[PDB]
Design a protein around this ligand. Structure first.
Ligand SMILES: CCCCCCCCCCCCCCCCCC(=O)OC[C@H](COP(=O)([O-])OCC(O)COP(=O)([O-])OC[C@@H](COC(=O)CCCCCCCCCCCCCCCCC)OC(=O)CCCCCCCCCCCCCCCCC)OC(=O)CCCCCCCCCCCCCCCCC
Ligand SMILES: COC1=C(OC)C(=O)C(C/C=C(\C)CC/C=C(\C)CC/C=C(\C)CC/C=C(/C)CC/C=C(\C)CC/C=C(\C)CC/C=C(\C)CC/C=C(/C)CCC=C(C)C)=C(C)C1=O
Ligand SMILES: CCCCCCCCCCCCCCCCCC(=O)OC[C@H](COP(=O)([O-])OCC[N+](C)(C)C)OC(=O)CCCCCCCCCCCCCCCCC
Ligand SMILES: CCCCCCCCCCCCCCCCCC(=O)OC[C@H](COP(=O)([O-])OCC[N+](C)(C)C)OC(=O)CCCCCCCCCCCCCCCCC
Ligand SMILES: CCCCCCCCCCCCCCCCCC(=O)OC[C@H](COP(=O)(O)OCCN)OC(=O)CCCCCCCCCCCCCCCCC
Ligand SMILES: CCCCCCCCCCCCCCCCCC(=O)OC[C@H](COP(=O)(O)OCCN)OC(=O)CCCCCCCCCCCCCCCCC
Ligand SMILES: CCCCCCCCCCCCCCCCCC(=O)OC[C@H](COP(=O)(O)OCCN)OC(=O)CCCCCCCCCCCCCCCCC
Ligand SMILES: COC1=C(OC)C(=O)C(CC=C(C)C)=C(C)C1=O
Ligand code: SF4
Ligand code: SF4
Lengths: 67, 157, 92, 96, 79, 317, 385, 178, 56
């Protein structure tokens, strides 16, 4: 019966969600719980870099009004 | 278990399983035995289930099933296709026309067996060897492929 | 760099396979049609290029000229195609 | 509806002995289906019949673990079936 | 016309093909929004708007962004 | 961590590649009244790994008349480009997001046509050269409409970055609009992966050309490549035209639906293969240059006009 | 012109075919098919074998239409013996003859598609084909290569359950033709691959001796089953499916219709099969019954002589043609008074058809040739003999 | 009685409605979608394949299969070397030479069926007066070496003893027919 | 057979035909094996009188 084709599809599927969940949590871990900034245009890289200089060395650390 | 002998027995068991599970056969398609296998490829006795490829080019074929009479004009070819198949390769002779000359044994245009042209591993008997009968023969090839111990021989050589 | 890292792993994975694959085991076919296609292909491929900047050009303040230009390009090439059809070309 | 099919499925799985049995069948016979034992020959082969299924698959044999010495756990071949029970399996005679 | 008909039923791609070619060559000419594209894109502020000195002779320029003077995009709003 | 991510994208995809093969051999089976491979392993799950091992062990054959590089470069290039094109794909977050992402995918695909050309010249047998020339032509032709169909899309997306479409398709799939091209993207995706309706690249009844002289490890690498592509192109359909729902709070329902739509459209080309006879070589090019290219070029203009007079010019960035 | 041979191993070559093609580019300008790769010496071996022991050879000439082939030898030998089969036997030969044309057509239509690239039609029908062989096996003991149709009458009576089982197969078979009907008859891809390919004009078809669906496909109205009714084809009603134009599509459509028309003939045979004996009662021609040879001396003598020596058919020569599924299959049996034949020229619908490939495949691509061989339903056993 | 297949009875003049219906057929591949539906339908049908080792394709009593020589219930082999099984074999497979046994009975010193030569016609089954040579049910006798396929009297007699119970049942079922 | 109604309905529709009425797989409709013993009829020429071969 067709249901036997499912085992194979399942294994494919599980192996196609891993990548999307993986890439989207190894980003939120490396960037400090905040989505990796996407610097499409320089302004953004500038702002990002500015952030680095503002604190520690990493941009993800984010200083606030209390600074 | 711990012994260079045990590791070399288990790993061929692995190598033999891979060749056994995936035999991609290449049928020349001589005479009528090819039909009695087109029935094996068909739904009542699927061959793919067992890991058998319905259609495989010589260079990608593990098993050659010679179905049908090997005339003296197709002999020079069979050998070529057997010679051009990849090394790990096996031959299954199907039909009393191929394993022996069968009706047409005494003909002037029929080779009396493909064993004369290509070394043969399993001989499947029957004028139209039944399709289960070919499937039993292919399964017998799988039993022969399980028994082979190439790695063991290299170790104790 | 991040891309470089990914790509070299990509080549490595493929070279690894072929290497194991080779290590574990231990004259005049010519039809102008074919050449003609290749040519047409680039004439179209070049056009694809002149059409690729259209996403940035959409935001151009002119707009009228943009479309007037783009429509002329697509129309003149298509006519090229038209004549390709009319002529034995594209009729293999 | 769907529950019914799942139910009959459970019956099948739970039917062939414990998990041990299911694995014995799942891996060597490649079919978890339950039928009525129509007999056990002196070699050890066990024959079953499920008239509900199509003609092709209403009569099956679950070969033995060892025949004439040889281990037949995985290396099962058809000829293992005894000549007496061969015709019953091939539907030559409808009588066990 | 008759061929047109068969063309609609035989080789019914070109017909559609050309039809679109034209409909794209017309809608822009006649539409209540075509003008907006050159405006909506014109308005989008990408480069800093440099302020002009106040000679004090200009009543048109707004002295402050929020002033009631200057350009507005309420057309963009409620568009 | 980046490597971890590199591994998370490539390894799973490769495994998915393998099981697609199994799934292709069971869905085609049940459609043809046969169980398909279930005897090796449980329900055939170990079947893909089994022939992989058989293929690598069998002797790679270097024809007497064969280049030894344009022969080994060709499968390496095929696997490298296909696995590489999974690098910049939104799921929803891309591993290496590239501002000109779709141009990367179009360019990388284009490079695979060489592997076919190089393998055909390398074999030095007539069947290979004839097959390669027709093949390169098919692939290239189906690139010209393939590219124009994307340019129509982009102009309604605003950018070349595949990441933008997740924000473009937050209210409706791009199938509703632009369905006429989806179909034409789907058929072109079928040609570029040399799948069935368009499998003349390597027709079997016709020239049993691409892998004629390729066995064992080389066979496998392209092989792997084709199937990974089969997925990738289907996945690009599932981002560009069928936009999976995106919620910024939970990113995986995007990937969960991406999983579901990709599998169904991957299932569709499997279903197409069993259902249709293969087109003739010229019948294939007759479709693209006569039937599709005029449709695509005109609908391309409609997609430069729809934005302007509907005052909908898409926001860059 | 880049000479290239369609070598035997290739699947589209039916196992044995070496079509020397001259490729003027992809367009093929000339074909020189080199058959002979399966010539077994079938007709020089028959001269050394008695009439019964040569029957088997006729099941192997066209190997996809076994019984219709052995109905041509059986009719010939019967003519030369001025004996006629009993009434039940003639219906059984017509019943088995149409099961064979359904069997050949399922072979021809599905394998043609396998060559073009459609793979599923073959699997659906091949399951319906093993259902059919079973009927051969249940009546003769061999799935194919039965030897059931004997030179005089048929060999053994139908088992007591066969006609019910043939009804159940015929009852549901038409839906199965209907199903590939939907999957491969309107697909633009099939029509394009098949329509307007290998057109053969009516007079050219007669001149090239095509004599088959190839004759009927171009509109010539000739069926040896209605024109020269052999066996009982005079008491069964059917419509010859004449095609109009001759493209490989019209020929496909004709083959699908003949499968449907054969179901109409099979229906009549089950509905009207007479009670009676299956083999003529002359012990001189057909062997005596098992009980009789073991209780009556005249029967043992007749069994001993018939099996050891033979019928000894009277001296003469005959050309008997029957409509085999491929086309007109005829045996020119020349007979001396001896029990073993002198000559047996098997006319093969197929020797003529393959000759037509060069003319039919004119101005055609490499791919068209694969369709051209497919639409001739050529089995090289009949051509090579 | 004839029947035109693919002959258009008349020229239906295009009507917009007709044209649209057709154009839609070409543009939206309507018939192609029809074909996909058929295959999806079977995907849901039960597959017809049989587990080959566990289940076997049905063969009725007349199946010819593999040659065997039977023996009388007493234990005397049935063959009396009349040698017409040799005479009617089409392939020249059976070779028989005989001499009067010590008992004085007629028996075959050598009976060799060359199975590779045999084409399993089943005439030998037919010809034997004592019905000593029978077509046995077994079809699975594939052999690694060509010599094993050649069969002498001892293999066939042994084949006969192994399958006698089923051979007797099969002959029992079909003898009235013969 | 043995298919949940819904699958059957999908089957019948996708195919466009009542495939259930004419299933290909055979179930308890096929002639049972061991059909009764057959007493076949003896044809003409078995008369014990006026059966001279010279006349037939
Ligand atoms: C996935 C969700 C469940 C799918 C499902 O249940 O399908 C069967 C179920 C019944 O389908 P069917 O074709 O009537 O099944 C044939 C018999 O009726 C029912 O067949 P049966 O009479 O043989 O019933 C017993 C069967 C019953 O098994 C089932 O019906 C459940 C199968 C679940 C597969 C998951 O259990 C078995 O025979 C052993 C196999 C069990 C499943 C093996 C594959 C599991 C894969 C797991 C990873 C994926 O499908 C539906 O209820 C409608 C699905 C509509 C989809 C559109
Ligand atoms: C004529 O040449 C042939 C073909 O080309 C047309 C075939 O497609 C086929 C048919 C082949 C198939 C569909 C099955 C083959 C499938 C495979 C090789 C895929 C197996 C999976 C893998 C390679 C493993 C996945 C990747 C890895 C190497 C490691 C994973 C990390 C055959 C048999 C053939 O001979
Ligand atoms: C990862 C790539 C694959 C590696 C091996 C995967 C598992 C192989 C396996 O499970 O074998 C099952 C196979 C199952 O097939 P089998 O050889 O037992 O025979 C099959 C019998 N019937 C037909 C009933 C199914 O068993 C073996 O191969 C035993 C040896 C395995 C050795 C593996 C370790 C080395
Ligand atoms: C649940 C699974 C559903 C499967 C549906 C297809 C198989 C069943 C078909 C049954 C059948 O025979 O009817 C076909 C029917 C049969 O019709 P016909 O060809 O016999 O004739 C009817 C049409 N006229 C009369 C005008 C000629 O075909 C159609 O109804 C038209 C189909 C048009 C398809 C256009 C291309 C596909 C859609 C592309 C746009 C994207 C759609 C969504 C894609 C996926 C998004 C997630
Ligand atoms: C931008 C891209 C636009 C398209 C670019 C390419 C166009 C190429 C057109 C070539 C037409 C001539 C031709 O060669 O084709 C004739 C066609 C048969 O074509 P075919 O069988 O494929 O063979 C081709 C070689 N003869 O047989 C034909 O006669 C086809 C006729 C096609 C035209 C039919 C009428 C089309 C216009 C219908 C308008 C309907 C109302 C539209 C309203 C629009 C409002 C804005
Ligand atoms: C095998 C041959 C094909 C190899 C795979 C195909 C690779 C195709 C690469 C296309 C260009 C990629 C690119 O442009 O990305 C540039 C990347 C980010 O740049 P950008 O998009 O502008 O973003 C800036 C703000 N975020 O940042 C970069 O600057 C990346 C710079 C190039 C990275 C290339 C990675 C290695 C690929 C070359 C490997 C060479 C060895 C193999 C040679 C094969 C020869 C046939
Ligand atoms: C404003 C627009 C109004 C409506 C416009 C409709 C546009 C349709 C877009 C595609 C157009 C395709 C087409 O025109 O047909 C070409 C060909 C059939 O054309 P043909 O019969 O060869 O005509 C000969 C004339 N030279 O078409 C083909 O050959 C199709 C071959 C298909 C082989 C695989 C088919 C798979 C079908 C199922 C999947 C369809 C896609 C569904 C998924 C899409 C993405 C979700
Ligand atoms: C139906 O016609 C024929 C075929 O093509 C579909 C063949 O493939 C073949 C041989 C094919 C193979 C490789 C089994 C034969 C013998 C044949 O008769
Ligand atoms: S063996 Fe019997 S069946 Fe196979 S080919 Fe020779 S004759 Fe035809
Ligand atoms: S016929 Fe029967 S008995 Fe006479 S020899 Fe041959 S086998 Fe022995």
């Amino acid at each position: 019966m067709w249901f036997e084709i499912l085992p194979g599809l399942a294994i494919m599927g599980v192996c196609l969600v891993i990548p999307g969940v993986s890439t989207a949590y190894i980003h939120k871990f490396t960037n400090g719980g905040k989505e990796k900034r996407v610097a499409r245009v320089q302004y953004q890289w500038y702002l990002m870099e500015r952030d680095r200089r503002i604190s520690g060395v990493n941009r993800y650390y984010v200083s606030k009004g209390l600074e | 278990r711990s012994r260079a002998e045990y590791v070399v027995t288990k790993l061929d068991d692995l190598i033999n399983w891979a060749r056994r599970s995936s035999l991609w056969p290449m049928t020349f398609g001589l005479a009528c035995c090819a039909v009695e296998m087109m029935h094996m490829a068909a739904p009542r006795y699927d061959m793919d289930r067992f890991g058998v490829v319905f259609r495989a080019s010589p260079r990608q074929a593990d098993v050659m099933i010679v179905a049908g009479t090997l005339t003296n004009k197709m002999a020079p070819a069979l050998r070529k296709v057997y010679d051009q198949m990849p090394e790990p390769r096996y031959v299954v002779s199907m039909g009393s026309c191929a394993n022996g000359g069968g009706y047409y044994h005494y003909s002037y245009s029929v080779v009396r067996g493909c064993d004369r042209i290509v070394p043969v591993d399993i001989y499947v008997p029957g004028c139209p060897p039944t399709a289960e009968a070919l499937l039993y023969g292919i399964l017998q090839l799988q039993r022969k492929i399980k028994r082979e111990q190439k790695l063991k021989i290299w170790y104790r050589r | 760099m991040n891309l470089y890292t990914v790509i070299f792993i990509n080549i490595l994975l493929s070279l690894t396979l072929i290497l194991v694959a080779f290590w574990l085991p231990q004259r005049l076919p010519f039809s102008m049609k074919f050449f003609l296609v290749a040519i047409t292909f680039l004439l179209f491929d070049l056009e694809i290029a002149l059409l690729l900047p259209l996403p940035w050009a959409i935001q151009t303040i002119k707009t009228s000229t943009m479309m007037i230009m783009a429509f002329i390009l697509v129309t003149i090439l298509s006519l090229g195609l038209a004549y390709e059809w009319t002529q034995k070309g594209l009729e293999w | 509806e769907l529950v019914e099919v799942l139910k009959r499925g459970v019956q099948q799985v739970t039917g062939h002995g414990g998990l041990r049995g299911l694995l014995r069948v799942f891996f060597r016979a490649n079919d978890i289906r339950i039928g009525t034992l129509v007999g056990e020959d002196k070699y050890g082969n066990k024959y079953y019949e499920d008239n509900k299924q199509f003609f092709g698959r209403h009569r099956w044999v679950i070969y033995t673990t060892e025949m004439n010495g040889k281990n037949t756990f995985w290396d099962v071949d058809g000829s293992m079936v005894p000549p007496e029970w061969h015709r019953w399996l091939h539907c030559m005679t409808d009588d066990p | 016309s008759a061929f047109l008909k068969n063309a609609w039923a035989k080789e019914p791609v070109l017909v559609v093909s050309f039809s679109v070619w034209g409909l794209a060559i017309i809608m822009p000419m006649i539409s209540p929004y075509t003008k907006y594209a050159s405006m909506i894109n014109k308005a989008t502020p990408y480069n800093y708007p440099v302020p002009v000195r106040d000679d004090g002779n200009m009543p048109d320029v707004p002295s402050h962004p929020q002033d009631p003077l200057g350009p507005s995009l309420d057309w963009l709003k409620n568009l | 961590m980046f490597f971890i991510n590199i591994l998370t994208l490539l390894v799973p995809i490769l495994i998915a590649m393998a099981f697609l093969t199994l799934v292709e051999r069971k869905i085609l089976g049940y459609m043809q009244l046969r169980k398909g491979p279930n005897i090796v392993g449980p329900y055939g799950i170990l079947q893909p790994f089994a022939d992989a091992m058989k293929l690598f062990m069998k002797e790679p054959m270097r024809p007497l008349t064969t280049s030894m590089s344009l022969f080994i470069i060709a499968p390496t290039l095929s696997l490298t480009l296909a696995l590489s094109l999974w690098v910049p794909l939104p799921m929803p977050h891309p591993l290496i997001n590239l501002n000109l992402g779709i141009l990367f995918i179009l360019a990388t695909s284009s490079l695979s046509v060489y592997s076919i050309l190089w393998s055909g010249w390398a074999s030095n047998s007539k069947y290979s050269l004839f097959g390669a020339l027709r093949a390169v032509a098919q692939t290239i032709s189906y690139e010209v409409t393939m590219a124009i169909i994307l340019l129509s899309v982009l102009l309604m997306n605003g950018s070349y970055s595949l990441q933008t479409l997740i924000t473009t398709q937050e209210h409706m799939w791009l199938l509703l609009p632009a369905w006429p091209m989806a179909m034409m993207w789907f058929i072109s995706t079928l040609a570029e992966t040399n799948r069935a309706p368009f499998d003349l690249t390597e027709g079997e009844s016709e020239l049993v050309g691409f892998n004629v002289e390729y066995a064992a490890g080389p066979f496998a690498l392209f092989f792997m490549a084709e199937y990974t592509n089969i997925i990738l192109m289907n996945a690009l359909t599932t981002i560009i035209f069928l936009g999976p729902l995106y919620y910024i709070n939970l990113p995986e329902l995007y990937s969960t639906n991406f999983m579901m739509e990709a599998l169904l459209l991957s299932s569709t080309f499997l279903w197409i293969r069993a259902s249709y006879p293969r087109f003739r070589y010229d019948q294939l090019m007759h479709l693209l240059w006569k039937n599709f290219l005029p449709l695509t070029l005109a609908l391309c203009m409609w997609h430069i006009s729809l934005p302007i007079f509907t005052a909908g010019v898409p926001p860059y960035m | 012109n880049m000479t290239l041979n369609f070598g035997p191993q290739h699947p589209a070559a039916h196992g044995v075919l070496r079509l020397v093609l001259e490729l003027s580019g992809e367009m093929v300008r000339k074909c020189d098919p080199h058959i002979g790769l399966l010539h077994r010496g079938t007709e020089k071996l028959i001269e050394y074998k008695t009439y019964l022991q040569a029957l088997p050879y006729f099941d192997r000439l066209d190997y996809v239409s076994m019984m219709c082939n052995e109905q041509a030898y059986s009719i010939a030998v019967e003519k030369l013996l001025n004996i006629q089969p009993p009434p039940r036997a003639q219906w059984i030969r017509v019943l088995f003859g149409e099961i064979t044309r359904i069997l050949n057509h399922i072979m021809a239509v599905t394998t043609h598609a396998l060559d073009i690239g459609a793979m599923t039609p073959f699997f659906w029908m091949f399951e319906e084909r093993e259902k059919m062989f079973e009927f051969y096996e249940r009546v003769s003991g061999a799935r194919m290569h039965a030897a059931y149709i004997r030179p005089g009458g048929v060999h053994q009576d139908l088992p007591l359950g066969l006609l019910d089982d043939i009804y159940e197969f015929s009852k549901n078979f038409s839906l199965r033709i209907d199903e590939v009907e939907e999957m491969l008859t309107n697909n633009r891809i099939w029509r394009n691959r098949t329509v307007d390919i290998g057109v053969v004009t009516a007079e050219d078809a007669l001149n090239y001796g095509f004599s088959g669906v190839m004759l009927r496909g171009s509109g010539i109205q000739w069926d040896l089953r209605k024109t020269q009714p052999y066996d009982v084809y005079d008491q069964v009603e059917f419509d010859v499916p004449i095609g109009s134009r001759g493209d490989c599509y019209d020929r496909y459509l004709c083959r699908v219709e003949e499968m449907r028309q054969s179901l109409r003939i099979i229906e009549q045979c089950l509905n009207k099969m007479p009670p009676g004996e299956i083999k003529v009662d002359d012990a001189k021609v057909s062997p005596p019954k098992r009980a009789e040879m073991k209780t009556s001396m005249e029967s043992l003598i007749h069994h001993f002589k018939l099996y050891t020596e033979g019928y000894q058919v009277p001296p003469g020569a005959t050309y008997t043609a029957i409509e085999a599924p491929k086309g007109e299959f005829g045996v020119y049996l020349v007979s001396d008074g001896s029990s073993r034949p002198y000559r047996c020229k098997i006319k093969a619908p197929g020797f003529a058809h393959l000759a037509g490939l060069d003319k039919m495949s004119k101005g055609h691509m490499l791919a068209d040739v694969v369709a051209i061989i497919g639409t001739q339903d050529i089995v090289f056993g009949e051509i090579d003999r | 009685t004839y029947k035109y297949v693919n002959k258009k009875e008349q020229e239906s003049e295009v009507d917009m409605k007709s044209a649209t219906d057709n154009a839609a057929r070409i543009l939206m591949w309507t018939e192609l979608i029809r074909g996909l539906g058929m295959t999806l339908s079977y995907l849901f049908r039960e597959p017809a394949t049989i587990n080959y080792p566990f289940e076997k394709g049905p063969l009725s009593p007349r199946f010819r299969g593999e040659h065997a020589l039977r023996r009388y219930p007493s234990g005397e082999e049935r063959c009396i070397a009349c040698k017409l099984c040799e005479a009617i074999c089409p392939a020249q497979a059976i070779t028989i030479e005989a001499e009067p046994r010590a008992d004085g009975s007629r028996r075959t010193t050598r009976y060799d069926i060359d199975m590779t030569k045999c084409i399993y016609c089943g005439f030998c089954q037919e010809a034997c007066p004592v019905d000593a040579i029978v077509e046995g049910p077994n079809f699975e006798f594939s052999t690694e070496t060509h010599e094993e396929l050649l069969y002498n009297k001892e293999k066939l007699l042994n084949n006969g003893d192994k399958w006698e119970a089923e051979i007797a049942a099969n002959i029992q079922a079909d003898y009235l027919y013969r | 057979a043995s298919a949940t109604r819904v699958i059957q309905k999908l089957r019948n529709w996708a195919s466009g035909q009542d495939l259930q009425a004419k299933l290909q797989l055979r179930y308890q409709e096929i002639a049972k094996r061991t059909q009764p013993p057959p007493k076949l009829p003896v044809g003409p020429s078995h008369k014990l009188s006026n059966n001279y071969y010279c006349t037939r």
